[PDB]
């Protein structure tokens, strides 16, 4: 339905995360796995990502995707999103942060999106697990059999059972929108955000609408700004820095809530 | 589909105040950037003002201060471009644009207004 | 402030062949995660301006895929693989990086 990402909308957008074994090293990745549920009976697995799905940078139509590349929440058409633990997964549903897929047995979890000029993919060490239904072990679901009871995670986009709590940003860091205009140490303004900053003795500590260049400082190298935004919130992960903002404990219901279906 | 929807075309004298109105529909997020923009008769256009319909953050041209102001509404989802004291040379074309919120940038202006023609002769 | 410079000032040109117009500006438009802040805007003559390629490369909605937009840093260039009768009207490449976020002096194209 539809109404779903426009709770998902509102406020909500997607984020650059610390990742580990990003290809061959540790990235602050775009597509940033965490909490992986990997908890149902036919190795259905759920991940919360950290870039959104669906949701374009206008509508929904729900075959593309956006992240947040730099400064800019840049949208493409989902061509190949990739999950694998021991052999590609066949995923079913994404939605919001979260995608939901069928993945083999396996002691990884990496996902990725193709983009074109970079893979962006993210990896995570957990034990996913195969479960089975009953009183025989199987390690893929059969052909014919008895139909029992499973928890497995719905593919339904939408359900009110749990929520997850979106939270202001904090400060985002950023040393490339700071320069030498003439001699001394100049700080860009991205035109629609305030850029907070500090720099060798203590200087204004608030940030401000426009440019400046500041005088106390002549090296690029012991003054820096965070970007701040109060437009867009973010889901409070683990690994983002916290906001002095410390309200809205908001609300994002979770797409995949776990409901008893037959195996 | 999304519809951006001006006044009409208006004459005034010069001395007086002056308020147009910029509508939004077909698009139910108030998360959006709209804005003014005058394009002067066989001139090109100027970037005037932008309002975030949210948090009513403004970003003004540095040429436009005092002259004119830019409001915006929630509840009718709607800018208000304001003068107090109309000029010869506020004869010209002001369209209302839309550009959805895309990082910390202002963005592209997706759909445009009809286009609002407001004239201030002697 | 950033000053925006377009190169033709007008454009004559037929259907069937391509058309190009370079937009120049006073520093470079790129960041550090390579991302181009352009907007090429169209406007017909009697109705308002709409958007056409934004992002400097990418693509908007509506538009079909003849048009095209390419380059860096500085130098941007509008590509038309072939033009037609109903592209006459005034091309616009603006920027947004640094407020005042200023429209370009302008380009007509027009039918020869």
């Known amino acids: 339905d539809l109404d779903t990402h426009f709770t998902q909308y509102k406020l909500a957008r997607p984020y650059i995360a610390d990742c580990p074994n990003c290809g061959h090293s540790r990235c602050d990745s775009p597509i940033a796995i965490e909490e992986v549920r990997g908890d149902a009976h036919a190795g259905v697995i759920r991940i919360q990502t950290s870039a959104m799905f669906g949701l374009k940078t206008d509508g929904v139509d729900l075959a593309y995707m956006s992240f947040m590349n730099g400064k800019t929440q840049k949208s493409i058409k989902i061509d190949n999103l990739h999950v694998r633990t021991s052999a590609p997964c066949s995923l079913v549903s994404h939605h919001g942060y979260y995608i939901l897929a069928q993945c083999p047995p396996g002691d990884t979890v990496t996902v990725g999106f193709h983009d074109g000029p970079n893979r962006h993919t993210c990896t995570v060490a957990h034990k996913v697990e195969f479960r089975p239904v009953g009183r025989e072990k199987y390690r893929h679901p059969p052909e014919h059999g008895v139909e029992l009871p499973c928890n497995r995670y719905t593919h339904k986009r939408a359900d009110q059972g749990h929520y997850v709590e979106m939270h202001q940003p904090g400060l985002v860091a950023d040393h490339s929108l700071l320069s030498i205009h003439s001699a001394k140490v100049k700080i860009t303004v991205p035109s629609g955000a305030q850029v907070k900053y500090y720099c060798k003795c203590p200087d204004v500590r608030k940030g401000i609408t426009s440019s400046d260049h500041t005088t106390t400082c002549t090296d690029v190298k012991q003054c820096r700004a965070y970007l701040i935004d109060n437009k867009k919130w973010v889901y409070n992960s683990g690994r983002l820095p916290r906001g002095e903002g410390d309200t809205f404990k908001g609300k994002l219901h979770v797409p995949f809530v776990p409901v008893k279906a037959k195996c | 589909v999304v519809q951006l929807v001006q006044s009409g075309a208006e004459v005034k004298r010069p001395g007086e105040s002056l308020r147009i109105s910029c509508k939004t529909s077909?698009?139910?997020?108030?998360?959006?950037?709209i804005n003014w923009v005058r394009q002067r008769p066989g001139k090109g256009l100027e970037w005037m003002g932008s309002?975030?319909?949210?948090?009513?953050?403004?970003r003004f041209n540095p040429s436009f201060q005092g002259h004119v102001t830019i409001s915006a509404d929630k509840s009718t989802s709607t800018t208000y471009l304001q003068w107090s004291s109309l000029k010869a040379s506020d004869t010209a074309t002001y369209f209302c644009?839309?550009?959805?919120?895309?990082?910390?940038?202002?963005?592209?202006?997706?759909?445009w207004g009809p286009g609002v023609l407001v004239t201030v002769s002697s | 402030d950033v000053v925006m410079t377009q190169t033709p000032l007008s454009l004559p040109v037929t259907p069937g062949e391509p058309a190009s117009i370079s937009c120049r500006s006073s520093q470079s438009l790129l960041d550090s995660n390579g991302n181009t802040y352009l907007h090429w805007y169209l406007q017909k003559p009697g109705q308002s301006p709409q958007l056409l390629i934004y992002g400097g490369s990418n693509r908007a909605s509506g538009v079909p895929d003849r048009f095209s937009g390419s380059g860096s840093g500085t130098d941007f260039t509008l590509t038309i693989n072939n033009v037609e009768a109903g592209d006459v009207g005034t091309y616009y490449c603006?920027?947004?990086?640094?407020?005042?976020?200023?429209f370009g002096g302008g380009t007509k194209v027009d039918i020869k």
């Open positions: 644009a839309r550009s959805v919120w895309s990082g910390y940038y202002i963005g592209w202006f997706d759909v």
């Open positions: 309002i975030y319909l949210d948090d009513s953050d403004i």
């Open positions: 603006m920027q947004v990086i640094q407020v005042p976020l200023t």
């Open positions: 077909g698009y139910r997020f108030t998360d959006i950037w």
